[PDB]
Amino acid sequence: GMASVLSAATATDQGPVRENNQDACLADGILYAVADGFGARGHHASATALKTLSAGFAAAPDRDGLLEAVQQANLRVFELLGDEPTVSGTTLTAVAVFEPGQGGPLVVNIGDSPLYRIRDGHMEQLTDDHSVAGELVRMGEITRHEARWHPQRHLLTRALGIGPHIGPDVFGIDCGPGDRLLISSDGLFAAADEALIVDAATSPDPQVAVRRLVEVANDAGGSDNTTVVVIDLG
Ligand SMILES: [Mg+2]
Ligand SMILES: [Mg+2]
Ligand SMILES: [Mg+2]
Ligand SMILES: [Mg+2]
Ligand SMILES: [Mg+2]
Ligand SMILES: [Mn+2]
């Protein structure tokens, strides 16, 4: 029979507008993550977060170890960037594809880099966004689609590396053999037609999928960095 992860792929794209690629991604064993940095030192924030995350998970690869690794990533970024004259930080969305004996697949997320499940041709967002617009979705006041065009969607309500304390969301991922998971920065949904995003995201070869996802975002104007991690489950 089949492994729980069949294959995975990643892509990151600065796009034609931004002066830096302040996104970062990670694909290492059963650990997958995206971090979208912001601010003058946002690239430092996201890269440092993932380096720390990776090391902490490797030292303790279970649910509690993952959550401690996220705390350590927060602390390390805040120690390095907290004395700057303006605020820089990062989002973080991490997936660990644990076996059932370790509680099954888990997502830990802070900010607005979503996790999606792709099943039977449908793409749905599993995480809530910690942004002004995302909170209105969490309040049942606007839809995810409306949140996409909300004029305050760019304003985060939770972020890593901006203070000594963080409260990420933590939850199991309802998924199984045949599903595809996608972690993305918000650049993917900045502008493009949702149908074309789903077309790209359902490409059979995950290496093709990640390339096509970046291209869809770019073709639509590439106003932000776009980073995607695709994981095919067995
Ligand atoms: Mg960014
Ligand atoms: Mg639909
Ligand atoms: Mg956003
Ligand atoms: Mg953003
Ligand atoms: Mg955006
Ligand atoms: Mn972004």
Side-chain angles (χ1 to χ4, degrees), residues 36 112 154 186 224:
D36 178 353
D112 70 344
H154 63 288
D186 71 336
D224 197 3

Side-chain angles (χ1 to χ4, degrees), residues 1-4 6 234:
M2 307 308 297
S4 291
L6 302 180

